[PDB]
């Protein structure tokens, strides 16, 4: 919800590739 | 309960009491989620440079009242001491000749000093780690009316040329220079990259570094307005001018300016609270008081910097109040 | 496939070195750690040039935004000292930078160079020509030089003034050990590579109709010749070495060719422009693409005949 | 045991930190991304200094191309406010930057610093020395400051002027806690490191006889003190933090020493100069050398006594 | 001999070397 | 000990990267 929680799911979906 | 009602529909602002380096994670929290954190300045930038730095977190909490029948520009530019620049123009008009006036962060004079003639006294160079802003409306649901639109302007500083003929026996022409800022025309634009929404849901936006690397810029002295004293916008080859009254133009960082255009129609009571956040890494002068608080820039975290670029790409241009 | 070259990274390599080998330049930008919104223009000037007999003609391909190259002539063996270099503009200047260069930063506010290449394709008869094409590269850099001007006031006031100027122009008269010398009939093909660790952006300068600005003496600017942009104007200098092409044509020799100059520049679109609608994101960082760039760049020759382009 | 650095990368570390402890400074440029043609010059000033009794003498070791350091004396406890810092040149200035500041960028076009170090070797005996050597570092940066000047015309006309100035000279009067303070007869030895993320090239300025250019007031330039270069001229400022050495000698003491200043700078050779034939390519990127560079940078003391150099 | 094939032969020769 | 000998120990002590 908070931009932080939102930031995490992007970072956490898989930043590497 | 009397207040569970229009309380939350106008946003709340503050309540008090994966393999990355901590400072690299902190860098991310600061860059993207500044409001969610009331903490000390995140160590700085987890990039190569590891010298003495003074991580400073600038914050401006200021209530604004937007005038009816006018679009008001809140330009959040990466200029050291200043929070944002404000200007107003009739609803259909252009901010052409319209001067953008400074709204400084608290304690400008202790950092940069009264006159620009002594701004680089305490701090010689700067670098921008983050810049974010949010407009929290405090108007009632029966009187507001209007829209908040956000987009970013890629304004960069240049040294423009102009020729000035000085009167003399035979008049003489001087090949003159002036420091100016490019891309100010964008004030009149509404790019295809904008956030348009009702006024009642103020925005929240943040910009990121617009350069391959985070480099240090020197703090400029003698600049009281962007096209400096005795230079016309036309000579400085620029759109409109930027004025700093109790401050001075210290320099421009490497971030895109966040342009918030709040447009209040005639008869609308639109009031809000503007909050600006900005972490700047300053190189402290051994002669200052705050040199004692300087700490080394965090160690390079290639993973933190890598996430910085991804998170920045999937992120929306701007978001509504509640989602900050 | 763990880690290979990102397509845009590979395309960056094609763009930089072998510009004319494909159907269309695969210039998808620079696989640099900047992923902001950019507008990449793949400039290309195709022009028929006929070299004046009895003179050396300098085609200085420098990284200046709207300009393809700077041309100047001098007698065979003479020095390009007082000789000013005139701009040969890339097509479509007025469209990007504007009519008067006081608008120059209206569509684009900053630039950064990805590729720069030049080629001379001789169209002379085999029994018509005579001469040589020589290519070397000059490292010009922009500077803020000082000079004092005494103004004719009652008690003449001296002013401590400055001007923007370009360094290393003296190289116009030099043939370094890193040169390409060859017959005219086999024109050349040469590209430049970024001369800095990083590809930083540069603001677009306004008001410059010549390098030593209008009203500044060549000597005040401390440079050896001047660059004159007529119509178009000096917008800035990119981070690449100028490719210096020296075609020396004898008397009676008919040296004609087709000059081609390529340059993919990443520009930062002004939100007020209609062009900020063609803009795309710069490609993601590709450390391997950048690694090959620096290597390939080290192993290729200064210039090649226009046949191995 | 586990040093997996490229030879030049390792050599770069010996160059930056331990300059005096080898047969020759390994001397290879910055093992970073840029791999163009470079002319790496290893400057070194070996001079016998006799410190004037009754005064503090500042030896500001700043990253200015031809100049070793700037020197200035002030009574003990006084402030170097209006006190000009005079240039103490590295040997062979005229042979690289020419005589006048109008032919400065003749051999070299741009520069970039790889190392900076200084050492004071006391040559007094145990019956004549007295005083202290203090070392700290100042973060000097170049700026284009603004000022308005009034020209005496019919109606006097006000001009908007600029000046290339240097920020941070105020620290020249304040000893921070990050300092080395020791007795004179244990001369110092310090070396500074890079001021930024990347080692980018800087153009070589011309026409600068002093930092606030000739005809500009120290106040117009918004500066603390001015830097004067006689013969030698201001070429630019590199990306190193200036090493400030302050030797305080009482009246009646004989403090003599051998001053030594080291500086390996990578220059971009001008194709027009004879020196171009000594130019070689920059070492290839070695992320390990550059990673070690910064850890060693952090864990390093501001200055050490002679014995630990 | 297109400059690309020339370029190709170079990184094909062995750019594997390193990167980080 | 010379500056190089100390530069060494710093290297020997550890670099994660």
């Amino acid at each position: 919800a908070t931009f932080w929680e939102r930031v995490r799911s992007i970072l956490k979906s898989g930043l590497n590739f | 309960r009397r207040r569970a009602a229009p309380r939350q529909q106008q946003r709340q602002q503050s309540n008090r009491a994966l393999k990355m380096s901590a400072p690299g994670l902190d860098f991310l929290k600061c860059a993207f989620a500044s409001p969610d954190f009331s903490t000390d300045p995140g160590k700085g930038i987890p990039d190569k440079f590891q010298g003495l730095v003074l991580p400073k977190k600038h914050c401006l909490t200021q209530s604004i009242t937007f005038t009816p029948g006018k679009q008001t520009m809140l330009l959040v530019a990466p200029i050291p001491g200043i929070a944002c620049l404000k200007a107003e123009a009739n609803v259909g008009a252009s901010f052409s000749g319209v001067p953008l006036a400074s709204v400084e962060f608290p304690g400008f004079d202790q950092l940069f000093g009264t006159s620009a003639t002594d701004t680089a006294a305490n701090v010689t160079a700067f670098r921008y780690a983050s810049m974010a802003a949010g407009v929290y409306p405090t108007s009632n649901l029966m009187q507001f009316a209007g829209s908040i639109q956000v987009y970013k302007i890629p304004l960069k500083q240049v040294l423009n040329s102009y020729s000035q003929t000085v009167a003399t026996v035979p008049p003489t022409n001087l090949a003159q220079n002036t420091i100016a800022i490019d891309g100010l025309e964008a004030l009149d634009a509404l790019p295809n990259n904008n956030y348009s929404g009702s006024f009642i849901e103020g925005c929240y936006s943040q910009s990121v570094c617009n350069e391959p690397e985070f480099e240090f810029h020197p703090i400029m002295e003698g600049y009281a307005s962007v096209p400096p004293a005795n230079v016309t916008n036309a000579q400085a080859s620029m759109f409109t001018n930027l004025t700093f009254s109790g401050a001075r133009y210290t320099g421009l960082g490497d971030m895109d300016a966040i342009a918030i255009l709040v447009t209040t129609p005639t008869g609308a009571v639109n009031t809000a609270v503007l909050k600006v956040w900005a972490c700047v890494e300053y190189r402290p002068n051994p002669n200052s008081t705050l040199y004692e608080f300087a700490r080394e820039s965090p160690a390079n975290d290639e993973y933190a910097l890598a996430a910085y670029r991804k998170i920045a790409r999937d992120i929306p241009i701007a978001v509504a109040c509640k989602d900050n």
Side-chain angles (χ1 to χ4, degrees), chain A residues 1-16, chain B residues 1-17 20-324:
Chain A
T2 57
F3 225 94
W4 189 237
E5 292 174 46
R6 136 139 56 188
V7 161
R8 294 184 317 184
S9 52
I10 297 180
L11 194 194
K12 204 182 181 184
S13 69
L15 161 280
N16 329 264
Chain B
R1 280 228 193 150
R2 213 289 138 137
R3 269 328 171 85
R7 196 313 76 161
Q8 266 201 3
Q9 203 162 308
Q10 312 167 335
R11 262 310 111 132
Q12 314 157 306
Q13 316 177 26
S14 178
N15 266 299
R16 323 97 117 252
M20 286 186 265
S21 51
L25 218 192
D26 287 14
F27 169 59
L28 291 184
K29 296 182 178 183
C30 182
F32 307 112
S34 332
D36 310 327
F37 307 99
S38 60
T39 47
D40 217 39
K43 246 303 185 300
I45 311 185
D47 112 293
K48 295 181 179 164
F49 172 96
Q50 280 174 53
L52 222 75
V53 140
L54 196 150
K56 199 194 174 56
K57 196 183 210 178
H58 293 121
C59 302
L60 172 106
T61 311
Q62 212 201 333
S63 212
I64 311 188
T65 58
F66 308 95
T67 65
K70 302 206 166 174
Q71 9 162 271
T72 91
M73 252 290 317
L74 294 170
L75 188 86
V76 186
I79 298 177
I82 290 76
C84 74
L85 291 144
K86 185 193 177 192
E88 288 195 341
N90 254 238
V91 161
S94 144
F95 303 93
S96 187
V98 189
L100 277 134
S102 72
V103 175
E104 324 105 53
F105 276 127
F108 180 103
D109 304 315
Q110 190 194 68
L111 233 191
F112 306 107
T114 47
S115 321
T117 62
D118 46 89
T119 47
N122 297 334
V123 168
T124 68
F126 70 100
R127 180 206 259 197
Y128 263 80
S130 77
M131 210 211 321
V135 179
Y136 309 80
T138 58
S139 221
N140 61 311
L141 312 168
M142 298 299 129
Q143 243 116 74
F144 85 95
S147 48
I148 296 190
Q149 298 157 290
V150 192
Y151 58 95
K152 316 284 177 58
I153 304 174
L155 27 70
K156 289 230 140 106
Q157 181 187 184
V158 200
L159 191 161
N160 288 118
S161 169
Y162 72 76
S163 204
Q164 202 193 75
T165 81
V166 175
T168 25
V169 186
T172 64
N173 289 257
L174 299 181
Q176 303 264 70
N177 313 285
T178 183
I179 267 184
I181 297 182
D182 282 3
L184 271 175
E185 300 88 8
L187 294 172
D188 296 339
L190 258 184
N192 61 301
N193 281 231
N194 69 277
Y195 156 87
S196 271
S198 179
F199 174 80
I200 255 309
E201 329 176 86
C203 58
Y204 173 61
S205 197
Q206 69 286 295
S207 69
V208 302
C209 188
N210 65 0
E211 213 67 84
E213 206 85 21
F214 286 90
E215 256 159 65
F216 273 166
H217 290 66
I219 282 186
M220 281 163 245
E221 299 174 298
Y223 292 86
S225 55
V226 169
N230 287 318
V231 175
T232 62
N233 304 270
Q235 303 203 82
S237 301
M238 54 193 270
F239 187 59
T240 212
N241 62 315
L242 313 189
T243 78
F244 313 90
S245 292
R248 268 115 184 286
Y249 177 78
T250 28
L252 237 195
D254 292 326
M255 314 266 279
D256 280 353
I258 303 171
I260 305 164
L261 219 200
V262 179
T263 150
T264 294
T266 277
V269 171
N270 283 1
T271 170
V273 175
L274 199 230
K275 302 203 74 144
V276 182
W277 297 275
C279 300
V280 193
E281 274 200 336
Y282 293 110
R283 276 201 71 64
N285 192 297
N287 165 265
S288 70
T289 282
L290 54 249
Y291 182 85
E292 176 220 328
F293 304 111
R295 40 194 165 152
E296 309 184 298
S297 174
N300 187 74
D301 182 8
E302 212 69 69
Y303 188 92
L305 295 174
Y308 180 72
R309 301 301 179 164
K310 181 188 174 173
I311 299 173
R313 231 207 76 161
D314 306 315
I315 237 175
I317 230 286
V319 197
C321 260
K322 33 171 284 103
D323 314 293
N324 65 353

